[PDB]
């Protein structure tokens, strides 16, 4: 198996090939989807649903959360939301490797209570072609 701490998401500080992990990041989830575009004819094998595969639109979504630590990289995610950009984000899988895809920054939400930490969640969605450098 692989450690959960080694599965990170990270930003573009300068915007051109400069990657730093964000902050207090208690949880990450790169999450893939496919739109399962159905093609079932009048005859299909006895009544089973037949699917095509490669014609479906496919995507990815990143849901990060953790404690509010003001870094050079936490303020960078603010500037993506107010000035709408699609920078090259990067989610590293412990042993798979770098994904290196352009995501938008769909939902950011800073939260805080009278007795606890300052936290933030951080939702994303895909915006282009992903990769896999292995």
């Amino acid at each position: 198996a692989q450690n959960g701490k080694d599965l990170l998401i990270k930003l573009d500080l300068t915007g051109s090939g400069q990657f730093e992990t964000i902050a207090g990041l208690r949880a990450t989830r790169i999450s893939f989807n496919a739109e399962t575009v159905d093609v079932t004819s009048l005859e299909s094998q006895g009544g089973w649903r037949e699917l095509l595969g490669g014609a479906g639109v496919r995507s990815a979504s990143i849901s990060g959360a953790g404690v509010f630590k003001d870094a050079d990289t936490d303020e960078r995610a603010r500037q993506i939301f107010f000035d709408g950009e699609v920078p090259e984000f990067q989610v590293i899988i412990p042993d798979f490797g770098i994904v290196q895809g352009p995501f938008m920054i769909t939902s950011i939400d800073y939260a805080g209570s009278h007795n606890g930490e300052a936290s933030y969640e951080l939702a994303m969605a895909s915006a282009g072609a992903l990769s896999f450098t292995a």
Partner: protein, 134 residues
């Protein structure tokens, strides 16, 4: 225990007594079996484990919430808190090598810290989680 825990204690004992700090605070007094003599009085002790079996279809793993206690006979116990500061930074983010199987991460958990017998000894437990793989 499961198959790994015989070598997990042998690895978290050998990661201790090679850490540079706590060779100057506790000394050579890192042991499961307390050797006979005059009982030095600022020792640490590494025995009370418990396992939780994080397994799967293919193979098996385990979650070891092993306890490393720090005992002191000093008047206050800023001595023990300085000694367990030297315990914990030696183990969190371990990158240990085992004799049978792998561990993927060595985190930290609860650390109770109270007065034990006759308000004289001061023992501070440290529960560390070790997710291993057999």
């Amino acid at each position: 225990s499961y198959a790994v825990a015989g070598a997990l204690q042998a690895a978290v004992y050998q990661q201790l007594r090679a850490d540079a700090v706590l060779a100057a605070l506790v000394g050579t007094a890192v042991y499961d079996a307390v050797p006979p003599g005059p009982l030095a009085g600022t020792y640490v002790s590494l025995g009370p484990e418990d396992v939780a079996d994080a397994s799967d279809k293919t193979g098996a793993g385990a979650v070891h919430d092993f306890v490393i206690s720090v005992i002191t006979d000093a008047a206050g116990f800023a001595t023990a808190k300085a000694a367990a500061a030297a315990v914990s930074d030696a183990l969190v983010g371990a990158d240990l090598v085992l004799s049978r199987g792998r561990l993927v991460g060595l985190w930290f958990l609860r650390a109770k810290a109270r007065r034990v017998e006759k308000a004289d000894m001061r023992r501070i437990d440290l529960v560390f989680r070790a997710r291993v793989e057999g």
